[PDB]
């Protein structure tokens, strides 16, 4: 590879706090690279924020981000920075740094993104979606009232992937995310096979195993 | 695997390691033709301060061909390296060396205080101070006509509102960063409806 | 300042057919020195950074299948996916890098078009555990269907519900090109215990008649 861009970890911050995320280029010829920053809000498109040439710190901004963020760089460690002074709730998004040898050139290398959350955390409540009483019956788990994304759901500790549909989360009017994960199984399995959904939520350090069974 | 084995490599060495450079007002242009250009030697070097490329990727053209490549070399000071770029203004960009707005190429610069400074001050490198109009892109003016700054016309004589158009840099080794000299190489690429002679080692 | 408009916003094309996306620029992006248009095409998938497919309007980036091709000049540009495949389902953006500020298109969603398939409909009452907390969530599942469009109408004691439910659709399945939908009716524990019949009426192109699934509270 000619260049790889590693980015800083996930950030959970409070409204008003400052934040500085990094993007380090790993590879030779970094003297020629310009690093840009792209914001992608949840479920929205790509917004080009700005770009910087670390060799002399020439910085160009998008009019939508001029004065709202500060794009710096430390050429001694091949690192470019993107920082806020006062975080708003409207800053919650994923931030990709993109590089390309030269300006007015395609951004042909990208980092895996840094997800920034400007709010407090909350663990989800997990409720069972029990099947009702030949063919095949469906069951699932309701993962409700958590923030932020994501939650990871698997069945039988990962031993049941066939026929599983974990729906994308939707933002309720309370500001919390709700989500349902369902799986279809043969109807005769409900008397024998045990069905457990495992809900992990890293931001709140919550792990819930929920037993699902028909309501007697 | 040993290779590739190339004989007609492009002479970027006699441009970048030229013992003597040139004043910015009389900038020097080297025509690159009929040779394979290994640009990796340029960007793998750890002895450059600035390597700003415009409209082209230096890491992506060692498998590309061009009709001709031009290597422009001169000397300015650190404050003026930022002026060797499209859409710039100042003494150097307006009166010495202008790049077009759609410039495709690289601007490579490095500090040359160890080479272009003398204890008594180096006064061989000159720059143009006045001109009756801005330079067109890639224009080279070497005339030494007296600049008429006032109503009265000079008869090739230097005097009241009549300036010699060339001033010298004061390159002393004790100058601060920005007043010490920097050697600059400007690679420009053109692609016409004509055969290509400058290709990368890949194809 | 250059602005890009893509079209269409959504595109459904059958397996093996030709998908074409258009990108309109408010200004030319043609460099005269090297006769090339400074327009790029990107592909993005969920949880992944954008992937560069085509640059200089019509040059393929490494790791891109031969079936991706770009064209155009001046202000009209075209991304063409011939012989559309399963893993080509993604969002496609056109970006200009003629001058800063760089700008993207609004995005074009590309999905696989297949034969119509009716949804298997299920309904789930709220759990007893959730009812202790004072909230009741009624879930209605529409499993493995195509196309995506499907009216889902909640009925509480035969009264049409409005403004109290959210829908969610899965990604198009890789193997059978079907979607799945979940509609979630939310109401207070008090309101939930006032009524008896909770019904989910699904209207879809694959159903010659609206299918309804229901349950009586606590049976
Ligand atoms: C010439 O180059 C080839 C590979 O391009 C290499 O195999 C060969 O040994 C080279 N010839 C020499 C080293 O004399
Ligand atoms: C001459 O310049 C080349 C770059 O074209 C560089 O690789 C080489 O080291 C230079 N020679 C020296 C420093 O003796």
Residue numbers in the entry:
A (entry chain H): 0 to 132, 137 to 219
B (entry chain E): 327 to 529
C (entry chain L): 1 to 219
Please quote the authors directly:
The causal coronavirus (SARS-CoV-2) binds host cells via a trimeric spike whose receptor binding domain (RBD) recognizes angiotensin-converting enzyme 2, initiating conformational changes that drive membrane fusion. Spike exists initially in a pre-fusion state where the domains of S1 cloak the upper portion of the spike with the relatively small (~22 kDa) S1 receptor binding domain (RBD) nestled at the tip. The RBD is predominantly in a “down” state where the receptor binding site is inaccessible; however, it appears that it stochastically flips up with a hinge-like motion transiently presenting the angiotensin-converting enzyme 2 (ACE2) receptor binding site (Roy, 2020; Song et al., 2018; Walls et al., 2020; Wrapp et al., 2020).
There are two complexes in the crystal asymmetric unit with residues 331–529 in one RBD, 332–445, and 448–532 in the other RBD well defined, whereas residues 133–136 of the CR3022 heavy chains are disordered. Only minor conformational changes are introduced by binding to CR3022, at residues 381–390. The light-chain interface comprises six H-bonds and a single salt bridge between E61 (CDR2) and K386 of the RBD.
